[PDB]
Design a protein around this ligand. Structure first.
Ligand SMILES: [Cl-]
Ligand SMILES: [Zn+2]
Lengths: 13, 126
């Protein structure tokens, strides 16, 4: 669940 | 209670975005969605830290709730992008509404994650 979130977050950079 | 603090911080970031969505122009949305996403990241890391101490029979339910939050953030980001694609069109306020609805869903699901953890803490007392 942390892995998935961190790649979701990449999209906002 | 770091879980309660983290949920509070995430819901506060969502309420902020929801008072700024209508006034702000759709291309100043990224910092607000980013603040929400990072609050969620903090919350998920705290919950991951906490799970090992809760009864095994509660882990699955907590894990599903965590996953739901991830999916919710995905939807928020998608609606944010759509609200950006349709600025100064006939769909601008509609997609702003959809973004609002996605953020609200995220806040509700964060509260339900807290509720599930809080019930597991009660069981742990036993
Ligand atoms: Cl709502
Ligand atoms: Zn804030």
């Amino acid at each position: 669940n942390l892995x998935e979130l961190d790649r979701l977050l990449x999209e906002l950079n | 209670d770091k879980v309660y603090e983290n949920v509070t911080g995430l819901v506060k970031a969502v309420i902020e975005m929801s008072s700024k969505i209508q006034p702000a122009p759709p291309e100043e949305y990224v910092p607000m969605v980013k603040e929400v996403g990072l609050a969620l990241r903090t919350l998920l890391a705290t919950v991951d830290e906490t799970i090992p101490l809760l009864p095994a029979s509660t882990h699955r339910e907590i894990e599903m709730a965590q996953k739901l939050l991830n999916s919710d953030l995905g939807e928020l980001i998608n609606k944010m992008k759509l609200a950006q694609q349709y600025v100064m069109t006939s769909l601008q306020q509609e997609y702003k509404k959809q973004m609002l609805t996605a953020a609200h869903a995220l806040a509700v699901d964060a509260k339900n994650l807290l509720d599930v953890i809080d019930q597991a803490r009660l069981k742990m007392l036993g």
